[PDB]
């Protein structure tokens, strides 16, 4: 088979919207605390560096889900439920896509790169850091491109089982068109390797575990004097 004129147009839609939202959030060397280069002003700045950058990421994510056909048709409640659970997973998807194997560094922007030790320095736990870098290598092992990532992130946003969804059955209906697009896409990309599509979905399995680990990272974060700025704290902090 082949891509339907519709699907193709949709896949182009997503890849383009993903490009524009990125430009609209990171085309400006962010106004965030600069990475130092020791003391408690870098250990508290480095952490601010990541935290402040993550915020922008949340804004890009929200901005891009608004472009995913079907997303705006749900209710604001469900938009929050969905977005509030996929932010950390979507972030790790992006972190993965932006991973360099030869240098083992994740480069967020141009002249904005970080090593594993940068993450440690930044305040994060080895418990969290290793799993994300391990996930990043697993991701490159699949050799995903821009269409597949866009598609995998869409599929991710529409997870019916996310906590507090009002219209799961509806969220689920919204997902399927994208799964298909990926199924048909992968069939074209490596017809001689049918199990490559399931290896992909499999990454969704790991993004949940990562999401749990990250929560234990939040939990432990708020055991130190490290507090998450308001926006992050909303989506991640446990508060009445």
């Amino acid at each position: 088979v082949q891509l339907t004129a519709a699907q193709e147009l949709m896949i182009q839609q997503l890849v383009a919207a993903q490009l524009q939202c990125n430009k609209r959030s990171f085309s400006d060397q962010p106004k965030v605390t600069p990475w130092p280069l020791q003391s408690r002003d870098a250990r508290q700045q480095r952490f601010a560096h990541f935290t402040e950058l993550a915020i922008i990421s949340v804004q890009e994510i929200v901005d891009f889900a608004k472009q995913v056909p079907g997303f705006l048709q749900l209710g604001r409640e469900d938009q929050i439920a969905l977005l509030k659970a996929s932010t950390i997973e979507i972030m790790l998807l992006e972190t993965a896509r932006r991973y360099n194997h030869e240098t083992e560094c994740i480069t967020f922007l141009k002249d904005f790169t970080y090593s594993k030790d940068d993450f440690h320095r930044a305040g994060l736990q080895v418990e969290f850091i290793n799993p994300i870098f391990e996930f990043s290598r697993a991701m490159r092992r699949l050799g995903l491109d821009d269409a597949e990532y866009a598609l995998l992130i869409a599929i991710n946003i529409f997870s019916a089982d996310r906590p507090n969804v009002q219209e799961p059955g509806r969220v689920e209906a919204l997902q399927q068109p994208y799964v298909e697009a990926l199924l048909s896409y992968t069939r074209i990309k490596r017809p001689q390797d049918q199990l490559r599509f399931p290896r992909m979905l499999m990454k969704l399995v790991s993004l949940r575990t990562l999401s749990s680990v990250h929560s234990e990272q939040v939990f432990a974060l708020r055991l130190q004097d490290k507090k998450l700025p308001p926006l992050l704290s909303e989506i991640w902090d446990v508060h009445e």
Partner: peptide, 16 residues
């Protein structure tokens, strides 16, 4: 409920 508990997030969804 999920809009009040998440004010800033709610705001991002409406600035569009």
């Amino acid at each position: 409920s999920l809009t009040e508990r998440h004010k800033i997030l709610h705001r991002l969804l409406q600035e569009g």
